[PDB]
Each structure stands twice: as structure tokens, then as C-alpha cells.
Paper text:
The plakin protein envoplakin is upregulated during keratinocyte terminal differentiation, and interacts with the closely related protein periplakin to initiate cornified envelope formation. Although their architectures have diverged, all plakin proteins except periplakin contain at least one plakin repeat domain (PRD), which constitutes a conserved node that links cell junctions directly to cytoskeletal frameworks, disruption of which has dire physiological consequences. Of all the plakin proteins, envoplakin is the only member to contain a single PRD module, which is connected to a central coiled coil region through a linker domain. The structure reveals a basic groove that can accommodate acidic patches on the cylindrical surface of monomeric or multimeric intermediate filament proteins.
The construct boundaries were selected based on sequence alignment, and the resulting structure was solved to 1.6 Å resolution by single-wavelength anomalous dispersion. The asymmetric unit was comprised of two PRD molecules designated ‘a' and ‘b'. Models comprising residues Asp1822 to Ala2014 were built and refined to R and Rfree factors of 16.8% and 20.5%, respectively. The two envoplakin PRD molecules in the asymmetric unit are similar, superimposing with a root mean square (r.m.s.) deviation of 1.1 Å for 183 aligned Cα atoms. The envoplakin PRD structure has two lobes and contains 4.5 copies of the canonical 38 amino-acid plakin repeat (PR) motif followed by a C-terminal hairpin turn. A novel conformation is found in envoplakin's PR4 motif, where a long loop is found instead of the canonical β-hairpin. A striking feature observed in envoplakin is the non-canonical helical structure and distinctive kink of H2 in PR2. The electrostatic potential of the envoplakin PRD surface reveals a polarized protein with a highly positively charged groove. One basic flank is formed by H2 of PR1 and H2 of PR2, another by S1, S2 and H2 of PR3, while the elongated loop of PR4 forms a cap. This surface area contains a deep groove which is ∼23 Å long and 10 Å wide. The groove is delineated by Arg1952 and Lys1994 at one end, and Lys1901 and Arg1914 at the other extremity, while Arg1876 and Arg1895 lie centrally.
Numbering used by the authors: 1822 to 2014
Amino acid sequence: DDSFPIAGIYDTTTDNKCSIKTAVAKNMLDPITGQKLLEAQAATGGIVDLLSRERYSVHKAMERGLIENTSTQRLLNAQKAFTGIEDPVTKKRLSVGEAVQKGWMPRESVLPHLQVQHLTGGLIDPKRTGRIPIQQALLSGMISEELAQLLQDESSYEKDLTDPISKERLSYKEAMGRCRKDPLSGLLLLPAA
């Protein structure tokens, strides 16, 4: 819905929603999984505020207490997948898929973010609404053949998240599947105790 990422956590013990930040702090969600969920938010348009559905840049999120100080640095990297970057030579704005091809960023750093973009409707073209399908991205040279193939093969995505309920290792796609929608906000919440 609305091409949003996983937004927050569903506290199964109290039947209440809570933020990723609160869940990590209360030991309801493992810290690494929490950080990756926040990266996915940065990479798709901003950190989600559960109370309003608004989304915020990393800096604005920290100032509003939506994230911890210790997350800010790594979240800025993920945020580039949304904003794109400026080419140091040509000064043009590049998507991160183009940055990889131009040698400015390593493929390994960028793939997870393109994966989350794909799973929420398609690749992001910086400064534009409307997601780009993988095949269109490939034909335009926005991504390489290898990145396209990796993005297409959803069943093979890395299982680097831990389901707080089952303790199973899940991919981002599987994690999305475990989510409920919040009755108030409509946003995706991952259950945790």
C-alpha cells in the first residue's frame, strides 16, 4: 500500500503498535534486524512516523526522536538510494544503480536497497514519484544485467532479518509477508513480543 516499506512493530503482548526504535530498546526486536528495517525506510523515502504516516529524512527523523543517534550515519548511506547522488565530475544526479556502474559505489552496498525498492513497487528514480520496473531499468542502463537478475530472483534474496516471533531468518520479502496492517494507520507492522 502506498509503496511504503515495513513501518513498525506490532506488540503482540499488549495489542499495541510501537516504533522500530522502541522495539529495539525494549529488546522485542534484534538490533541488526531493526537497523535494516530502518535502512529500508531511508531507502524508500524516509523514516516512518507511525503516528502521522509522515516520512522524514534521517536528520529530521533523529531530531524528532524517531531513531537513535547511533543509527544516523548508516542511515545516511541508505538514504542515498532515495535521493540519488551527485556525480563528482559531471555534477549530474545519479540513481544508486548508475553510481554502481560508474564506479562510485560498490554493488554489495547498494543491492539490498534496490531490493527493498523493488519489493515496494519498483526502483526509485531520484526526484520523481512513480517507480521503475526492473526490465525498464535494465534496458535504460539504470542497472546492470547482473543486478537485474539478482533483483528478479526474489526467492533468492538474502535472509538477513530475524522474525521476532518465530526466530526464523527471513528475507525482506518474507518479512513483509509476516506483517499485519495497523487498524488505525493502515501501515505494515511486524509482530513481536
